[PDB]
Amino acid sequence: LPISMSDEGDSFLVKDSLGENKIPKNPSKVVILDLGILDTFDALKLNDKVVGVPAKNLPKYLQQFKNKPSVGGVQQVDFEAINALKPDLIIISGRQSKFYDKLKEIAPTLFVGLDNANFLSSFENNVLSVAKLYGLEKEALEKISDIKNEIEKAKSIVDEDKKALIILTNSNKISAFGPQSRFGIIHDVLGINAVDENIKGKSINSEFILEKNPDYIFVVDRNVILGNKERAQGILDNALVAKTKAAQNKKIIYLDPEYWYLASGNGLESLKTMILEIKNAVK
Numbered sequence: 001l002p003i004s005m006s007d008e009g010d011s012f013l014v015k016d017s018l019g020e021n022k023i024p025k026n027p028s029k030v031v032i033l034d035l036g037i038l039d040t041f042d043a044l045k046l047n048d049k050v051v052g053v054p055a056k057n058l059p060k061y062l063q064q065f066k067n068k069p070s071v072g073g074v075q076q077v078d079f080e081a082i083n084a085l086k087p088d089l090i091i092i093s094g095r096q097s098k099f100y101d102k103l104k105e106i107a108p109t110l111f112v113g114l115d116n117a118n119f120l121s122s123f124e125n126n127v128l129s130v131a132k133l134y135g136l137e138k139e140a141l142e143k144i145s146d147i148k149n150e151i152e153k154a155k156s157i158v159d160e161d162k163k164a165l166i167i168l169t170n171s172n173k174i175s176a177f178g179p180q181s182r183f184g185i186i187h188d189v190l191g192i193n194a195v196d197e198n199i200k201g202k203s204i205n206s207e208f209i210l211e212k213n214p215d216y217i218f219v220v221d222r223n224v225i226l227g228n229k230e231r232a233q234g235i236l237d238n239a240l241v242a243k244t245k246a247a248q249n250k251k252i253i254y255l256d257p258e259y260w261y262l263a264s265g266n267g268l269e270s271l272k273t274m275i276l277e278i279k280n281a282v283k
């Protein structure tokens, strides 16, 4: 899984989960398909190195990239746009690893997908590997070290005797998520305890939410990105959920899907912002 780099000379020899590539030092035409790593390009001030972004799903907090050429959205990738960009590096995560072999036949292709078993070290590893390509380890490391400092302050104020449920809404169905899921940060990094123990979505309904009776419900609404009419606020407005501690104490928290579901915490900007979003809610 983890990312290792050996300095040849003009270039690095980089091994990741999917394979090995000859990527040059200071690549100047980069296609980026992971949104978290695109916020990490912005943090380290490398906007001009980015030649193409997936503009279909481009979040509010990355609209400084709205006029980069589009190479698609996160599901469907435009090979003929990526192709005409003559990039020297393409960066992808899990949603594009389907196309690993075809993108590799165009350019060195770096996988930077997160490991939900080891979020912090795989996150730190992705950020540093990228900064290593441009010689910005120093700047990245102090930015990581800030994030770690904000984490410890978020933990301080966590009340250990309270439990949380994480759920995702889709059309009018609901799914539960736990530890080491794609949303596991809340449990694994910030240490908020889970109401239930269950494998890495899990289909549930409102009676399940009540017999569990969480103090917090963190809600990720997929409907927005999917372009559906319905919303989580509508779905969770029933008399079963109204009886939970979380409802009675107004601790049903709608998390920003652009952060939690699209970038998934895989950037310097997004992770810091997500830690603060939880901090202010469990406060």
Ligand SMILES: [Zn+2]
Binding pocket: 142, 143, 146
């Ligand atoms: Zn600082």
